[PDB]
Amino acid sequence: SKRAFELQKSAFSEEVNIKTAEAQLAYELQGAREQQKIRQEEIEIEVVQRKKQI
């Protein structure tokens, strides 16, 4: 009985840990995805500036 319980508990812990591990790093994934556009505009700043430095 102890073996059956431990096997089932470890099996459940497998996917619960998988889902958690996705959960923490979804934040970083979306953060980088947004930083793409953030830096795009932060660098378009001086593009616009140098356009009229002409």
Next chain:
Amino acid sequence: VVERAQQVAVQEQEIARREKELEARVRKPAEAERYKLERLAEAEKSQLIMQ
């Protein structure tokens, strides 16, 4: 990749900025110096001939 793909546009504006600035700071001073040399040489010839 986004950073570099916009730094290329920064340099695309920089090439024309360098065009204008280099023209102003090199070509026009060269023309002015050539005119100055022409006029001073003409004056020196005019003085030397009649002396």
